[PDB]
Structure formats: C-alpha cells, structure tokens
Design a protein around this ligand. Structure first.
Ligand SMILES: CCCCCCCCCCCCCC(=O)O[C@@H](CO)COC(=O)CCCCCCCC
Ligand SMILES: CCCCCCCCCCCCCC(=O)O[C@@H](CO)COC(=O)CCCCCCCC
Ligand SMILES: CCCCCCCCCCCCCC(=O)O[C@@H](CO)COC(=O)CCCCCCCC
Ligand SMILES: CCCCCCCCCCCCCC(=O)O[C@@H](CO)COC(=O)CCCCCCCC
Ligand SMILES: [K+]
Ligand SMILES: [K+]
Ligand SMILES: [K+]
Ligand SMILES: [K+]
Ligand SMILES: [K+]
Lengths: 101, 106, 101, 101, 101, 106
C-alpha cells in the first residue's frame, strides 16, 4: 500500500523486535553490577515497554553503561515509531480531506 | 548486597503441628524470595517461588507468605519427611544471595 | 464533519472509556499481590491518567502481569489519541493554509 | 500571519499562564493534606514544568483530589501546545515543499 | 535538500550539543547544593538523555535553580527536535502520496 | 551529608592472611565508593574505585565489594608493604566525604 502505511507498520514490527532484544540485552548488561534490578527477563520486558512509551515509572532502570545504551535504543525506537504513526495518520487525513473539499 | 537472615537456626516442632520459618531481608525486595529444601546428603529442591507461588510436585502442606523485608515459609502439620535444612534466596538485586538456613527438627 | 475530526473526537471518547475501564481492571488485577498499591479506585483513576499522558510520576504502578498489560493498553490508548489529535490539527492547518495561499 | 502560527504562539502564551496558575493552584490544593510536598511556589513551578513536558521525575507530585485535577490541566495544556507546534511545523514544511516541487 | 530534512537534521545536531552542554552545565550548577546527585559527568549525560526523551526514571534530577533551568532547556530541545522529525516525515509522506494518487 | 563509618579503627592480621576493611554509609550510595591507601608520611593513593573496579599499577591482591550502605576492601594474603591507613570516600551525593580511616597492622 501507500509508503507511510508501509513505514508505520514496519515501525511496529521493528519496535516489537527492539522490545524483545532490548529486554534480553538489558539483563545481559546489568547482571554483574551490584545493586542492579533489571536482571530477570519478565520485568525487563515490562521495563522496555514503559521506556519505549516514555512513561518511565522509575520502578526499574539500568545502572550500567551498556544497559543504559540499550535503554537509549529502546527509547528512540519507541519514539520514532510513534512519530511515524502520527505522520502516517496525518497523511491519510490530509490526502483524505483533499477529497471532501 | 542483600543480606538474608534466617533465625532461628534450628526449629523443633511436635509431629503434626504447624511450623513457620522466617527470612528477613536487609532491604525491601518485593516478593522476589524463593525457598529451597535440602535433606541430608541431598541437593537443594525448589519449594516455593516468589514468596508464595506453589511448584508442581510439592505437597500442598507447604505455603509461603510475605513481601518487602519479612518472609515466612509455613508447613501445615509437619511430618518426618520434612526433616531437612531450609534456605531462602532472593533475586530482587544482583547478586542473588542465600539465607544462612534453618534446620527442621521434630 | 471531516474524517480527522471524527477520528479525533472518537479517540477522546474511547480514551475516557479506557481510563475508567483501565482503572477498574487494574484494581482487579493488583489485589491479591502482596505489596501492591494500585488497589483502590480513586487513586487508580489518577494512575491511569498519568499513564495515558506518559507523565508517570512513579507514585503508583502495577506489579502483576495483568495489571501491567492493562497499563500497556492505557498507554497506547492515550498516546494513540494524542497522535490522532495532532494529525487532525495538521490536516486542519494544512487544508486551511492552502486557502491563505 | 497564517492560522497555525497564530495557534502555536497562542498555545505557548496560554501554556505559560497555565504553568503559573497551575503552580499557584497546586499549593492551594495541597496545603492541608498531611504528607504533601507540593506546598511552596518555587518548586511548584518546577513541578508544573516537568509535568507539562511529561518528563515527571517523581520528585514532587499531588496527593489531593484538586491538586491532581490541576495536574491533569497542566498535562493537557503542555501536551496540547506541543501537538500544535508540531502540526504548525508540518504545515509550514508541507506548504513550503509544494514550492520546491 | 528539502527544508524539513535540513531542519530535522539540524535539530539532531543541535540536540547532541545540548545533551553535552546540558550535561556539563548541570554538574556545574548542582555541585555546592547539599544532597545533590547530578554531580559527575557520565551519569549527567545519562540524565540529560532520559530528560530529552521525556522518559524521566527519577533516578537523577536537579535540585538547584540553575540545574533545573538547564533541565528545561534540555527538555525543550529534545521535544522540539522530535516534533521536527515527525513534521518532516509527514511532509515526506504527504508529498510522496500526492504522487501515488 | 553522608557519614562514612570505618570500624574497627585498627586491624591486626598475621602475615599472608586475608584481611577485610569495612565502610558503612549513613544512607544508600549505590557503588559510589572509592578506596585510598596512605602510608606513613605519604600522600593518599587510589586503590579501588566504584566499590570494586581495579586501578592499573595496583597489586591484584587488592579487591573491593559491596553496594548500598555496606562496603568492603579486601586484601588476599597481606604483606608488609600493605601497612598503612585506609580510607573510603563517596561521590554519590554532594559534598564528597571521607571515612575516618582504618590502620592496618601486621
Ligand atoms: C531472553 C529474552 C527475554 C525477553 C523478555 C521475556 C520476559 C519474560 C516473559 C514475561 C512475563 C512472564 C511472567 C512471569 O513468569 O513473571 C511473573 C511472576 O509473578 C511476573 O511478571 C511480571 O511482573 C512482569 C510483567 C511484564 C509485563 C510485560 C508486558 C509487555 C506488553
Ligand atoms: C470501578 C471503576 C473505578 C474507576 C475509578 C474511580 C475512582 C474513584 C473516583 C475518584 C476520586 C474519589 C475521591 C476519593 O474519595 O478519594 C480521596 C480521599 O482523600 C482522594 O482521591 C485521590 O487522591 C485520587 C485522585 C484521583 C484524581 C483523578 C483525576 C482524573 C482526571
Ligand atoms: C503564587 C504563584 C506561584 C508561581 C510559582 C512561583 C515559584 C517561585 C519562583 C521560582 C524560584 C525561586 C527560587 C527560590 O527562592 O527557591 C530556591 C531556594 O534554594 C530554590 O528554587 C528551586 O529549587 C525551584 C526551582 C524551580 C525552577 C523552575 C523553572 C521553570 C522554568
Ligand atoms: C564536561 C562534559 C561532560 C559531558 C558528559 C560526559 C559523561 C562521561 C562519559 C560517559 C560515560 C563514562 C563511563 C564511566 O566512566 O562511568 C561508569 C562507571 O561505572 C558508569 O557510567 C554510567 O553508569 C553512566 C551511563 C551514561 C550513559 C549515557 C548514554 C548516552 C547515550
Ligand atoms: K513522556
Ligand atoms: K515520563
Ligand atoms: K517518569
Ligand atoms: K520515582
Ligand atoms: K519517576
């Protein structure tokens, strides 16, 4: 279909991948750092979900260099994909209004 | 690192009575506590996970409760096969750590 | 009226529904989990509001699997609706500028 | 000038007003509630700023019904204004590209 | 290339600058305030990154007047740049759809 | 301001034995603790940073552990050159502060 939809869908699929990879990689980077809490996979997936959406409750977060980098990748992927859905909707609404007018 | 205190070190109960093991963490760890049973010359065996979740194959007699810093492992009506050492283990913060242990004596 | 406005309005009404349902369902999922704080309805409605907007102060949050899922639904509904209002405004501004030019 | 710019500017000015009013009103609603921390004006202005941007560190937040309502007004005003600037930029970029093409 | 891309790219480069400057300036403003935690550069860079994205875990935040101001600058720069990328994408998608139609 | 408590003030170990210095913070400071060695008439020397990170040029014998409020500096098999005063220092919150010190005696 139209490019924007292809870009929006693609940057959902990619986001889901980043959530799983970002969840597996955060546990890998954080174990070994005394005091770290992002160390088991289930809560790490929850952590990534609340990071990508930018809600960030503060119940869990990375304390190591690599865990933080992973965090930045998760943030950008989520923000980027949401900005791509908004842009795709605007295109659909704009192109659609050109008709109603 | 989180210190898990198990006191008393030895517990004596009469056959069939209700017994309770205590585990105290040096800081709040939610419900990230797990219990193991180790009989003489045996390897540890998972009894209860996440403070109160049951494992399959484990007698219904065993139960756990608590959250935060205080945790309890309970046995409704103890019997001879329950004679063993009991250990708690936390997974809230790295590194995982074990309590020192409580011996069940009948 | 124009599609975008119909979509924006609709994804306000839907959001208000998710806030109430998401508030009722979080209490249902969280009671029974030792240590949980999202257990009375008034503060749960406040929790959902700060989740949907993505502010997330950290004063309240779900600790159970289902409460978290509900949380993800509340997040997406809020983010989605805000992205639909922004897209509707852009359409109104764009279509409106075509005139001024 | 063009509508969108008039709407974007207007929903900056309005935001600054909400930040000051939202800061004065939160102190009014929160004093009297045992345990409340949003009770002096300087930090309340900082609180509103981090709420409107949706960053929400969790260092300060309302615990009363009215303080929370004020919080919701501050959130919507900030989110709304940012969505109006993004929409205004898209209109400027779109209308501007129609030329380059 | 097209304006929007020039504006999006520019408000990436500018953001990276604000992250480094905002990280250096927060340490400068916060040292001297008893209780402050935003006092070493590495974690301050992490702090700025989580501020600009609006995730705000609450693990670190400014307590002084100037550190907070810096925080507001970091917030606006991040939010502004993300709103400029979304607007640039919409322009690319819109202009691109005019073709497919 | 964070108070760093170093106790005991003096430690006596036999040559080659394993010794451990303790540092307790008045509040949680993650792993933002650093250790220094100061020999008689010498200036302080960085031994371990961030609770457990090694510095180049420092004997492998030296190690550190801990997080939160409790920290330990360990020396596997002490020798004569280790006779000195030991200080911890935190950088979690302003202002930086030093523990009172422990003297190593053989
Ligand atoms: C190696 C790749 C790892 C990828 C991540 C996989 C994580 C594990 C699966 C997730 C949950 C398993 C449940 C469990 O056994 O934990 C529950 C015990 O009470 C509590 O769950 C939790 O409290 C975590 C909730 C996470 C919710 C995430 C919602 C995302 C839309
Ligand atoms: C079953 C469906 C449930 C749906 C949710 C219903 C929640 C209950 C109604 C809300 C408040 C009642 C007040 C009360 O008795 O509580 C106050 C006691 O001091 C404090 O209020 C609070 O502190 C909570 C504030 C919540 C503010 C939400 C703002 C949303 C725009
Ligand atoms: C009645 C209407 C009230 C409206 C709000 C007015 C608030 C008071 C003025 C603000 C600061 C005064 C400084 C002071 O005496 O406090 C400082 C003492 O160390 C610390 O400041 C603080 O730590 C608060 C910082 C707030 C930063 C806000 C940045 C917004 C872009
Ligand atoms: C004067 C200008 C200052 C500008 C900021 C510079 C900050 C210092 C460089 C950053 C890290 C050095 C590592 C180190 O020695 O610290 C590590 C020790 O364990 C832990 O790192 C940390 O835990 C901080 C992680 C920060 C991640 C930021 C990710 C941004 C995409
Ligand atoms: K946010
Ligand atoms: K946030
Ligand atoms: K937050
Ligand atoms: K918090
Ligand atoms: K928070």
């Amino acid at each position: 279909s139209a490019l924007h939809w292809r870009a929006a869908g693609a940057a959902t699929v990619l986001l889901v991948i980043v959530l799983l990879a970002g969840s597996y990689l955060a546990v890998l980077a954080e174990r070994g750092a005394p005091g770290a809490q992002l160390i088991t996979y289930p809560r790490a997936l929850w952590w990534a979900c609340e990071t990508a959406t930018t809600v960030x409750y503060g119940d869990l977060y990375p304390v190591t260099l690599w865990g933080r980098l992973v965090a930045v990748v998760v943030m950008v992927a989520g923000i980027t994909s949401f900005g791509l859905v908004t842009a795709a909707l605007a295109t659909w609404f704009v192109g659609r209004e050109q008709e109603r007018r | 690192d989180i210190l898990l205190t198990q006191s008393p070190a030895i517990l004596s109960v009469s056959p069939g009575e209700r017994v309770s093991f205590s585990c105290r963490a040096s800081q709040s760890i939610g419900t990230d506590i797990h219990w193991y049973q180790q009989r003489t010359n045996g390897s540890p065996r998972l009894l209860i996970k996440y403070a109160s979740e049951s494992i399959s194959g484990i007698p219904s007699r065993f139960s756990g409760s608590g959250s935060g810093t205080d945790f309890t492992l309970s046995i409704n009506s103890v019997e001879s096969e329950d004679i063993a050492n009991y250990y708690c283990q936390q997974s809230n913060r790295w590194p995982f750590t074990f309590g020192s242990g409580t011996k069940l004596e009948i």
